[PDB]
Ligand binder design. Structure first.
Ligand SMILES: [Ca+2]
Length: 223
């Protein structure tokens, strides 16, 4: 997160870190046994780390649970990043309390104008590299489909939306990928892609979760 603020410990209780020896991606806890993340985050050997604030210190609210199964979206295309979404089942159920909690799925899509909370342990510099230890947060609006498409001609599908600021300076970044975009208490987006970070006229591009709720629910029901 570039141009954000320190969230505060365990204030984003659905935020997870994906670990394969180091933090490499975010995700969101959507029930006690399932995590939603970006398909471009897929790899084997994932450990899900819940209840984190400082990813480099054991602080006392962590739960570390191995993935038992990963499911990339059937239609994921790694070249276009269309359908950049994946489900991870945990080997055991997480224990849910105030500091570790699931996030609601949307029953309807969000619209342009709605403010959202984006969070992660990704890079904090736009023209630089500095990775935080503690979770960072940014409040940002959804942008119109037209300004999204004008920012990225020929690249925005119906499964993507833009959020952030056209002026630059505030955005998600490398290492935030897979993490949440939550609007009025609903998981509306997944950190997916963008040209650089926090650059002028190059807002964040997010997976449009509302398009996937049917796939998410049926997948959970059968696995
Ligand atoms: Ca920790």
């Amino acid at each position: 997160i570039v141009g954000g603020y320190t969230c505060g410990a365990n204030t984003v209780p659905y935020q997870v870190s994906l670990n394969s020896g180091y933090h490499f991606c975010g995700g969101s806890l959507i029930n006690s046994q399932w995590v939603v993340s970006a398909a471009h985050c897929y790899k084997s050997g994932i450990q899900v780390r819940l209840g984190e604030d400082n990813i480099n210190v054991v602080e006392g609210n962590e739960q570390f649970i191995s993935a038992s199964k990963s499911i990339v979206h059937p239609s994921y295309n790694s070249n276009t990043l269309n359908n950049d979404i994946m489900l991870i089942k945990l080997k055991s159920a997480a224990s849910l309390n105030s500091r570790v909690a699931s996030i609601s799925l949307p029953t309807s899509c969000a619209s342009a104008g709605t403010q959202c909370l984006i969070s992660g342990w990704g890079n904090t510099k736009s023209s630089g590299t500095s990775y935080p230890d503690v979770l960072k947060c940014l409040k940002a609006p959804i942008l119109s489909d037209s300004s999204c498409k004008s920012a990225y001609p020929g690249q925005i599908t119906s499964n993507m939306f833009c959020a952030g600021y056209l002026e630059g300076g505030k955005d998600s970044c490398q290492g935030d990928s897979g993490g949440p975009v939550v609007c009025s208490g609903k998981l509306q987006g997944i950190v997916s892609w963008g040209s650089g970070c926090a650059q002028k006229n190059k807002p964040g591009v997010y997976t449009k979760v509302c398009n996937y709720v049917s796939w998410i629910k049926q997948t959970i029901a059968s696995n």
